Design a protein around this ligand. Structure first.
Ligand SMILES: Nc1ncnc2c1ncn2[C@@H]1O[C@H](COP(=O)(O)OP(=O)(O)NP(=O)(O)O)[C@@H](O)[C@H]1O
Ligand SMILES: Nc1ncnc2c1ncn2[C@@H]1O[C@H](COP(=O)(O)OP(=O)(O)NP(=O)(O)O)[C@@H](O)[C@H]1O
Ligand code: SF4
Ligand code: SF4
Ligand SMILES: [Zn+2]
Ligand SMILES: [Zn+2]
Ligand SMILES: [Zn+2]
Ligand SMILES: [Zn+2]
Lengths: 303, 303
C-alpha cells in the first residue's frame, strides 16, 4: 500500500522499499528533487535557471518540477534539423511552454549555422552524435552565458549517469551531478541524477505531461542503450544496483585558454566547436555549398 | 586466415584482432599462459603446484597446460557430495588424471566431515554457495600447506574476474591474479585470468579434453551468471570490453591471528570454517544426527 496514506499504491520502487499512490508519488518526486538541489547546492531559491529541454520525458519533467519549486526556469530548446523528428520535438516543447506560460528560447541549428546535424555529420567526418553533442553543449553554454544565467539544468537521470560511468570503465578510449561555474562557463546541474529512468517516466505520465515518445535515429547513442540494457538486466534481479553503483563511485575519490576564435574556454588554440564549424564551412565551399567569401563568425563571449 | 601460417583459421578472437588455426591456437594459448606466469612471477620453472581441479573446462585445461609447461602439477579435487553431479565430476577428473599419469588428490566432504554441501547448507543457515565456497578455499589451502606446496593454481578466467569486479561495484554488500604466500597461507595464482571463457573452452575442445558439461544446481552462482550476461552483452558489440574493464582496474591503485581451533590465519578468535563446522555439528547433535560426545577435530596446522 501507499506508505504515506495507506491507500492503493500506483508506483512501486523496490530499490528504495517504497510504494506510493499517484498523488504522493508526484509529491515525493518533487520533494526529493529539492532534497537533491539543497544537498548539493545546485540552485539558490527562486534563481533564474536555464533548463535544457529537448521535448523528451526527462527535461520536460525537470522543467515542470523546477517551476513548481518556484525557480525562474527558462527553457532552451535546440532544433537539430533531423527531419520530421526535430520538427515534432520542437512542437511538443513549444506546446508545453505555451500551456504553462513558461519562457522558451529556441536555437535552430540550420538557421544559425546553415547545416543541420545530418549534413554536419557528412561534412565534419565525425559521427553524427559527436558533432551533435558538441554543438548542444556549446550552444547551451553560450546561450546561458550570453543571457546572464549562472546555472544550467539538464535532465540526465540515474540510468544515464550509470551508463556513462559503466562506459568509461569498459571503454576509456571513447560527469558528476554538479559542475561549478567558471569564467565563460556556466554551472551545470543534474537534479534528476538519482531518479531511475522508469521513475522519471512515471512522474511524467502521472503528471499528464506530453513528451516526444519516439527517439532520434541515433548513431552512437546506441552505445548508451547497450550500457543501459546491461545495467538494467542486473537491476531487474537486484534492485538498487544502479544506485549502489553510482553512489559508490561518487562517494569515492587543468589549464584553460580562451578560444582565439570565439573567446570561450578551451584547452587548445581554437575550441573544438569553432574548429568543427570552420572545417565544415571550409569543406562546404569546396563542394561548393557556400560562397567563397563567406566566413563562419561565431558569437564572441562577453564582457 | 591464420595469422601464423596463412591457412584456414579455426578460432577468431576479435578482441585481440587475432585469428588462428587449430594447431597454432593451442600453441598460442600455451605460450600466452607462460607469458602470464612469467610476467607476474606466478611460478618457478618446474615447481610443484597444487592445481584445484573441479572437472570443468577451465581447471582441467589449466592442469593440461601447466603439465605441458613442465610444472609438477598435482591436482586436488574436492567432492562436494552434491548428488550424482559431484559423482560424475569426480569421475571425469579421475579419468583425466589416469589417462595422463598425473597425481590426483581427493577430499570427500561427506567422508571427512560427515556432511555434503546440501546438508551443510541446511545446518549452517548460510546459502549453499557460502558454506561450499568457504569449505573449498579452506580445504584447498589446508591441503596445500599440509603437503608442502608453496602455490595453488585455480582456473578462474577473464569472465570470472570481470564478473567479480562488476559485482563488487554494483554490490559492495555481498581478487587479483596473484596472492602472495604467508604463514599458514599458500600462494594463489590465476594463470587464465586474461583468457575469456570462450577462449578457454576453445582450447579444451580443440585439445579433446573431456570435462563435466553440466553445471551444479547453483544457488548464488546465479549471480555471477547475471554479471557475465551483462558483460558479454557489451562484449558482443564491443570486443575487448572485459579486458579493458579488468586491465583498467588492475593497472590502477591487516592483522591476522592464528585460529585457536585449527591454527590457520583468521581475523577473529576462531576462523569462519571452524565456526561453521562447529555450529553444524552442534546443530546436528540437537537433531540429533551426531552422537553427543562427538567433537569436530580440525587438522591443526604445521609445523
Ligand atoms: N535538442 C536539445 N535541445 C535542448 N536540450 C537538449 C537537447 N537534447 C538534449 N538536451 C538536454 O540534454 C539532456 C540529455 O539528453 P539525452 O542525451 O536525450 O538523454 P535523455 O534523458 O534520453 N533525453 P530527455 O528525455 O529529453 O532528457 C536532456 O535532458 C536535455 O536536458
Ligand atoms: N570441487 C572443486 N574441487 C576442486 N577445485 C575446485 C572445485 N570447484 C572449483 N574449484 C576451483 O575453483 C575454480 C573456480 O571454479 P568455479 O567457481 O567453478 O568457476 P568455473 O570457471 O565455472 N569452473 P571450472 O570450469 O571448473 O574451472 C575452478 O577453476 C577450480 O580451479
Ligand atoms: S541521438 Fe546522436 S544524433 Fe540524435 S540527437 Fe542524440 S546525439 Fe544528436
Ligand atoms: S554452485 Fe554454489 S554450490 Fe554448487 S558448487 Fe559452486 S558454489 Fe558450491
Ligand atoms: Zn498515498
Ligand atoms: Zn571557439
Ligand atoms: Zn596456423
Ligand atoms: Zn579454524
Amino acid at each position: 500500500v501507499c506508505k504515506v496514506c495507506g491507500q492503493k499504491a500506483q508506483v512501486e520502487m523496490r530499490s528504495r522499499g517504497l510504494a506510493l499512490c499517484r498523488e504522493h508519488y508526484l509529491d515525493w518526486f518533487v520533494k526529493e528533487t529539492e532534497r537533491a538541489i539543497r544537498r548539493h547546492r545546485m540552485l539558490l531559491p527562486g534563481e533564474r535557471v536555464l533548463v535544457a529541454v529537448s521535448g523528451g520525458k526527462d527535461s520536460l519533467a525537470l522543467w515542470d518540477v523546477l517551476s513548481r519549486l518556484g525557480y525562474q526556469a527558462v527553457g532552451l530548446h535546440i532544433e537539430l534539423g533531423i527531419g520530421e523528428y526535430s520538427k515534432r520535438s520542437l512542437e511538443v516543447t513549444q506546446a508545453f511552454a505555451r500551456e504553462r506560460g513558461l519562457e522558451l528560447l529556441v536555437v535552430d541549428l540550420k538557421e544559425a549555422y546553415g547545416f543541420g546535424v545530418p549534413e554536419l555529420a557528412r561534412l565534419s567526418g565525425r559521427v553524427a552524435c559527436s558533432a551533435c553533442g558538441l554543438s548542444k553543449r556549446y550552444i547551451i553554454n553560450q546561450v546561458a552565458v550570453e543571457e546572464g544565467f549562472r546555472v544550467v539544468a539538464t535532465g540526465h537521470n540515474l540510468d544515464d549517469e550509470a551508463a556513462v560511468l559503466f562506459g568509461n570503465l569498459l571503454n576509456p578510449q571513447e560527469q558528476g551531478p554538479v559542475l561549478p561555474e567558471k569564467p565563460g562557463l556556466a554551472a551545470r546541474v543534474k537534479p534528476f541524477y538519482r531518479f531511475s529512468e522508469r521513475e522519471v517516466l512515471s512522474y511524467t505520465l502521472l503528471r499528464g505531461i506530453r513528451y516526444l515518445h519516439e527517439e532520434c535515429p541515433n548513431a552512437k547513442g546506441a552505445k548508451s542503450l547497450l550500457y543501459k540494457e546491461a545495467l538494467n538486466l542486473v537491476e531487474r534481479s537486484m534492485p538498487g544496483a544502479k544506485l549502489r553503483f553510482l553512489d559508490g563511485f561518487l562517494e569515492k575519490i587543468v589549464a584553460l585558454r580562451e578560444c582565439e576564435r570565439c573567446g570561450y574556454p578551451t584547452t587548445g588554440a581554437v575550441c573544438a566547436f569553432c574548429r568543427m564549424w570552420d572545417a565544415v564551412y571550409r569543406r562546404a565551399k569546396k563542394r561548393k555549398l557556400l560562397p567563397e567569401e563567406v566566413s563562419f563568425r561565431p558569437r564572441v563571449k562577453p564582457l
